[PDB]
Amino acid sequence: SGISLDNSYKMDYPEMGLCIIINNKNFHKSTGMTSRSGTDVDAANLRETFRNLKYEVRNKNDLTREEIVELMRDVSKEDHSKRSSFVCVLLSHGEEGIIFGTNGPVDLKKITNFFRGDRCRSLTGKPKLFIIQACRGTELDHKIPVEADFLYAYSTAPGYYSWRNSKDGSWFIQSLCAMLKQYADKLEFMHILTRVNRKVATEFESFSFDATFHAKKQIPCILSMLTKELYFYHL
């Protein structure tokens, strides 16, 4: 045949892949963590958005740290050979490097390690996307590498709080779903996420009766170890 290029991930496998949404709203009283009002709006928006991208969506609600680890282990041991990609969305409390189960924390590295190129062979060479709505602190504003082909779409910069509106959902997830709905059939994923960065940074500002938390801004951040362009469509 003619000249062939290979700069984009193959996204025409029989299945787009799994989209696992972990939606933690209510936390065990002994942890002292507040309920995350608005997170159901986020989870419903994500389910619809990724359904329209033809992902097989699984929604999980209020998982303990042990259930989160078992879920991720089990999913990583499925046969993904017919799937183009893998998506995991985490909606919870967090700190830098940490997501909360309902009864305590989970290292993000523990979750993502299950999908390393050497530990999930049916996803080797395929994009693994982790979308994280959670705080990252308390500031206010041997052929391929085993860490290759991961993308972390973080709601907020390292060290910073992340903002959630109790009526409308989180700023980041609202914006992410809007930009995927508008541009997934047109733009490469990094360009979509750049538009999410701009939407969050320009269209949102906190309102609080507490001067410490009032009039604050947010910038998300994209951490890419991808090796190819990612388009959700194919020719």
């Binding site: 995350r36 608005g38 959670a134 992340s162 959630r164 509106n165 109790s166 938390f213």
Partner: peptide, 4 residues
């Protein structure tokens, strides 16, 4: 508006 709330923080996570």
């Amino acid at each position: 508006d709330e923080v996570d």
